[PDB]
Design brief:
The structure is a homodimer. Chain A is α+β, with helices and mostly antiparallel strands. Chain A folds into 3 domains: about 170 residues, GMP Synthetase, Chain A, domain 3 (2-Layer Sandwich); about 100 residues, GMP Synthetase, Chain A, domain 3 (2-Layer Sandwich), CATH 3.30.300; about 110 residues, 2-Layer Sandwich (GMP Synthetase, Chain A, domain 3). Helices cover about 30% and strands about 25% of the residues of chain A. In chain A, strand 8 and strand 9 form a beta hairpin. In chain A, helix 1 crosses helix 2, helix 3 packs across helix 4 and helix 6 crosses helix 8. At the A-B interface, strand 1, strand 2, strand 3, strand 7 and strand 8 of A face strand 1, strand 2, strand 3, strand 7 and strand 8 of B. Bound molecules: potassium ion (3 copies) and magnesium ion (4 copies). The site of one potassium ion (K) has 7 residues of chain B, from strand 2. Chains A, B: Homotetramer; dimer of dimers.
Amino acid sequence: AKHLFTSESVSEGHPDKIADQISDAVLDAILEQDPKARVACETYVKTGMVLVGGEITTSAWVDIEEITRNTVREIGYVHSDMGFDANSCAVLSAIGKQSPDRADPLEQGAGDQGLMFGYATNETDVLMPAPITYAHRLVQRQAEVRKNGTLPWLRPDAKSQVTFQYDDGKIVGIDAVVLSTQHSEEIDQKSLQEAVMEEIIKPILPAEWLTSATKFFINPTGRFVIGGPMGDCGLTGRKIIVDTYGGMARHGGGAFSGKDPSKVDRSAAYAARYVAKNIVAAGLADRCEIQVSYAIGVAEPTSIMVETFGTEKVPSEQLTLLVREFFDLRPYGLIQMLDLLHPIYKETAAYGHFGREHFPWEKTDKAQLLRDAAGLK
Amino acid sequence: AKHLFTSESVSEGHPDKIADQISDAVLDAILEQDPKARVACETYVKTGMVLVGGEITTSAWVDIEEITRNTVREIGYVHSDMGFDANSCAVLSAIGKQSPDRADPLEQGAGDQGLMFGYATNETDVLMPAPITYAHRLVQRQAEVRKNGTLPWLRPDAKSQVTFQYDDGKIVGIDAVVLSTQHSEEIDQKSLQEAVMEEIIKPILPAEWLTSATKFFINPTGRFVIGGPMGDCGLTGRKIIVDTYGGMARHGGGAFSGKDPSKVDRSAAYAARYVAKNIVAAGLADRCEIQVSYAIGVAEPTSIMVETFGTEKVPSEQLTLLVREFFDLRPYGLIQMLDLLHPIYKETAAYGHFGREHFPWEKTDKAQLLRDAAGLK
Ligand SMILES: [K+]
Ligand SMILES: [K+]
Ligand SMILES: [K+]
Ligand SMILES: [Mg+2]
Ligand SMILES: [Mg+2]
Ligand SMILES: [Mg+2]
Ligand SMILES: [Mg+2]
């Protein structure tokens, strides 16, 4: 019935997200020269320094120092007084390089085991959960307005957290909203508070959802002048939830950034979002979670399961049927189905991996074809 | 109805878990001298090296080099030929120290926002999900037998993944089992395969669950001689799922290790396991997930929600009622309720944080008292 759920998001320039973006920015850069490169690049960011370390198996030659500094500069950490300067921080690499030396490629077995969970739900335009959609849209507004000179006393680092009240299955409205933005010395908190309200919160959160009763908490501790990796620590794979579905859906361990698409931890997860978005887009269910798992060197998935949580329009038996017809969940099948061997990966690393319609895993192309085999309707 | 679920676990000495254990081992050591120390210590492990970096606010003086090497030695990476030697690897710190300089302590607001999810379910003895319980028990056996001279050709690093088949809500049995163990040069795979079967798998997995149809995959790629941080990368907070509930339950972003109990990301999560285990232990439901959230500098939780997923014995209204009576979910309340300011944290860092009955969050003490207010029965 009535009950509430929460999801947080952070911006580009929160320290773990800096790490994600740099990892994915090396990955993109390597993919650009060598689309079949196998890469796993993990990054750690602390007040002075960025350490980017990984194994890469490629022919590409890339400049990790340069890639690091340019990513840190778009985010905007450009002066010691913000916390971190892209132009003078230390960059260290410990990247170990290797150079590359079944009859049907598609049958090649999964490298590493694991479980990936994908979800979709009709509660938004983008078939995503409303919480995490709004949480991202907030932090995203924050960067936009920061970067576009509107509220140029903002600094990079920022968190949002929306909490939504649902009477059963229907988003009723927004109980609380939290928003905290790093900002300059020369603005004080009450003046900040109407700017964040007017220019960030008011244009994103939908007004009939928003009420007398909505508890807003903009910079609740006040001040927050120095952020980013000053006094804190970013490392890749730490904002796993924000990255996916804000905790609306489950998650098996795994991080995405710095992982080239052969890594099932990333590409099975993308593929799984893709089957669930297609299932719901065709009205086979209202909301659908899928778990695929893999075992090392088997190529067919060791498990599939769907939970259309009471929301079917065709029984789950038949659904599990069609999941295997329309979708090649084999490790090399996913790459194929979704055309993954491209430098599309950096834009993924902030603002969430799913729910953005221009990613190959978000396209609803198998929609009707899936309805058909499920009994055209 | 019939459908299947999977969960993985890894051992001590899988590289991210090495990182967790070292983080928590510094934490324990600081807590031992200064129980009120605020600590956040993140660790990164790569072939040569361990980098332990964090902020700590304490009076304690501890030896990070020494703590690092002793943890790496119990795990057992002791010679270059395994991949990593505790006695010669590089240890670097970038720990930034500070020295400590509302009227009711319990009312002090949460430092940092977030969402924590706790779960319990009656499907095991320990009120945990059967998958993750069995997955851990496998990797745990592996270390036991390794360490106790039974199968001393084993090496530290190892993954398990059990996949369970459930007809509705009842574990029916085990479809697949995967187990991969680092091992010495002087044992080959078929001989390894009956040892892993007899001495590891056969004494852990329950036999009526185990069948003709169970697909076992012991070292499926074969060989696996060198592991640990050789050629790979561990960092804290990467085995978040294994750490909790194997993906049976949801998770809001956050890691535990290296975080002193003031960190809600850790202690709210422990507290949440604790409310759900108590609820189910009292038979208010068969299985219960709780989300608490917090906003920065508020002290009452911004949300609670329970999902007894159709399994109640008292309506969820009244359940949400009692959650707030028996449990002080305020940041300083949790510490209190669960007596957290102690060096109990290292044993947490491998084999899973919940489901082990001797942790203060696993004790079922509020059991009957909770049944009572819910209508004694
Ligand atoms: K993580
Ligand atoms: K990674
Ligand atoms: K941590
Ligand atoms: Mg953090
Ligand atoms: Mg993995
Ligand atoms: Mg890993
Ligand atoms: Mg947090």
